[PDB]
Amino acid sequence: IINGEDCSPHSQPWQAALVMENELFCSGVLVHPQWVLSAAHCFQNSYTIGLGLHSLEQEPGSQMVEASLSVRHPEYNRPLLANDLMLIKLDESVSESDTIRSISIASQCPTAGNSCLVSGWGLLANGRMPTVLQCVNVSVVSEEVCSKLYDPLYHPSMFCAGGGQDQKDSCNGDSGGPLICNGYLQGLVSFGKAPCGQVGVPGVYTNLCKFTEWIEKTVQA
Ligand code: NI
Ligand code: NI
């Protein structure tokens, strides 16, 4: 996370850490006690998912869960970089707590100007990993602007957020992480232009308002 602050501990109880070989590579979002929503490009053959966390590895009530089952969106990367979402089925349901809670997905598609929140353990402005979960606010960008600077990769499965002079943005490690608007999960950290935090270049997020029916059906199967 670029230019953010240490999260107030367990303020984001839906944050799911995706680790392999004792190393974080992506994040995810708890949308159901046995289901984690993430970016399709965070796909792995098996998952080690950390819940109720703030530091990594340390915190009680925290759970480390196995996951051998995930479902990328059938149209992921068709066209290029589009439909970047997947669902992970936990081996065991999680018992929700105060530090582990689910969030619902926004029905309404994103609104230009809305100040939203994105969280993760991604790189900082200094280029080094944090020890504490990072939060930061970015504002949704109008479609015309989002469509024109990301031509020809712009797709309706995408919406832009951030790109302000405050240089607040998500980066490597934040992938698959949540974009919370108005208490609802509005998007997933998908991609941007390198480097992170460029003025005038908003981050691109998975437009979850377009997959509510796909997500539901996948969970019911
Ligand atoms: Ni704590
Ligand atoms: Ni990524």
Residue numbers in the entry: 16 to 38, 40 to 67, 69 to 74, 76 to 125, 127 to 130, 132 to 147, 150 to 186, 186A, ...
Direct quotes from the study:
To gain more insight into this mode of inhibition, we crystallized KLK4 under identical conditions but in the absence of PABA inhibitor. The resulting 2.3 Å resolution structure (KLK4-Ni), a dimer in the asymmetric unit, contains a nickel ion bound to the His25/Glu77 site, but not to either of the previously reported loop I sites. We also show for the first time that in the absence of PABA, a nickel ion is bound to KLK4 catalytic residues His57 and Ser195, stabilized in the crystal by interactions with Gln183 of two symmetry-related molecules. It is therefore unlikely that this nickel site is physiologically relevant. Inspection of B-factors together with discontinuous regions of electron density in loop III suggests that the KLK4-Ni structure is more flexible than the KLK4-PABA structure. Loop III flexibility is also consistent with missing electron density for loop III residues 74–75 and 73–74 in chains A and B respectively, even in the presence of stabilizing crystal contacts. With nickel bound to this site, we observe discrete structural heterogeneity in the active site of the KLK4-Ni structure; the Asn192-Gly193 peptide bond can be modelled in two conformations: a canonical conformation where the carbonyl of Asn192 forms a H-bond with the backbone of Leu143, and a non-standard, flipped Asn192 peptide bond with a loss of this H-bond. This non-standard orientation has also been noted in other serine protease structures and is chemically inhibitory since it negates the stabilizing effect of the oxyanion hole on the tetrahedral intermediate during catalysis. In addition to direct effects on catalysis, we propose loss of the Asn192-Leu143 H-bond will increase the dynamics of Leu143, and destabilize its interaction with Ile16, shifting structural equilibrium towards Ile16 release. The simultaneous finding of flexibility in loop III adjoining the His25/Glu77 inhibitory metal binding site and inhibitory conformations at the active site suggests a correlation between these sites.
